[PDB]
């Protein structure tokens, strides 16, 4: 059984980033969609869309990629260097307003699931509401 | 019973007294109910002694029976004086 | 300080004993545990049970001595 969906999605994204494929296709969820939107806003992905592969609702994700690095190891540069599902199921981490992480000292982002919706670290700080630290993104 | 009394803290030869509200059967350093004021015998500071008046009055009303020195201090401050 | 209060007595090797050490029956008295000289080891002088060797006994415990001279 697919035991965590959000985490799975994140993993897929990571894989895509590693492989230099322009677009991947993850199963449909509202939470997932919101997360994707947030990511897009941040700039971590090129965009997202919802489609239907076979007879199942699906989410296409446009991966953003850095310009081609000239010379040795000629791969383009990565935008999503690292993702981590922090609030792992049966471990599930929750933070207050004071314990909101400034991950990579303002450069990397965490995404928080909150009473006020799924939202960014900065936004959370502004609004003054703690919640579920779903994912570390940098 | 309940007493307004002076709690010694500080150093040797440098005493400091807490004008305080506490039970009679207690350590002269012990778990007191409330810190109402403070007093330095050595008069070393300009604001050498100070007690909050209203609280003291309230305590008195309730029935806090002060120690003699404490009473004197209170009087000096201006608690027992009424108009 | 360096205290040379050591007995330098002759003895016949009798028993093949442990840790580069040979029970040597002394002419001063008993068979002890007296171990090889480092010099001897360096030179690889092999000793058999039946050599008339010089033993360096330290008076603190006559149990242990030292096989000094080459045979």
């Amino acid at each position: 059984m697919l035991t965590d969906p959000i985490a799975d999605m994140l993993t897929r994204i990571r894989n895509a980033t590693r492989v230099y494929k322009e677009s991947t296709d993850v199963p449909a969820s509202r939470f997932k969609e919101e997360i994707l939107r947030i990511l897009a806003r941040e700039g971590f992905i090129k965009g997202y869309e919802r489609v239907d592969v076979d007879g199942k609702p699906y989410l296409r994700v446009y991966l953003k990629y850095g310009p081609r690095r000239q010379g040795p190891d000629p791969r383009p540069e990565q935008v999503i260097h690292h993702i981590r599902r922090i609030s792992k199921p049966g471990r599930r981490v929750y933070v207050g307003v004071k314990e909101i992480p400034r991950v990579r000292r303002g450069l990397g982002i965490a995404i928080l699931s909150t009473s006020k919706g799924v939202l960014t670290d900065r936004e959370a700080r502004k609004l003054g509401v703690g919640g579920e630290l779903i994912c570390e993104v940098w | 019973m309940v007493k307004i009394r002076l709690a010694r803290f500080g150093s040797k030869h440098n005493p400091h007294y807490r004008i305080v509200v506490t039970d009679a059967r207690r350590k002269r350093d012990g778990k007191y109910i409330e810190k109402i004021g403070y007093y330095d015998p050595r008069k070393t500071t300009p604001d050498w002694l100070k007690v909050d008046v209203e609280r003291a009055r309230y305590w008195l009303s309730v029935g806090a029976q002060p120690t003699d020195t404490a009473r004197r201090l209170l009087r000096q401050a201006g608690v027992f004086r009424q108009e | 300080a360096k205290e040379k209060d050591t007995i330098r007595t002759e003895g016949v090797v009798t028993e093949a004993l442990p840790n580069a050490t040979f029970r040597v029956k002394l002419d001063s008295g008993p068979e002890i545990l007296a171990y090889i000289s480092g010099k001897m080891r360096m030179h690889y002088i092999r000793i058999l049970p039946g050599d008339r060797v010089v033993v360096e006994i330290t008076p603190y415990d006559p149990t242990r001595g030292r096989i000094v001279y080459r045979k």
């Binding site: 049966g90 471990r91 599930r92 981490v93 929750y94 | - | -």
Partner: protein, 99 residues
Amino acid sequence: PKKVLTGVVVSDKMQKTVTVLVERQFPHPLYGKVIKRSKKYLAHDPEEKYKLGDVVEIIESRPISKRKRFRVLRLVESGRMDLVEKYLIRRQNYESLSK
């Protein structure tokens, strides 16, 4: 504010007494994960009005017996005996691993 608790009636095997399973979900003080952790409370029922497999509201009260410090306030919902069954099964299992 007396301690008000939610739990199921697991045992009516004694007169005037209901046994109540109160399940509290607290996070682990170090590992940050929630443990669904249970405790049994013996509650006073002056009528035997309450029965095997009822979820009830249990109030912290003045004692009636040695570890019977709870009054039964009201019945919340009656007939979710599944939990009770589970508890029973657990108990049965407990018998198994002795020798």
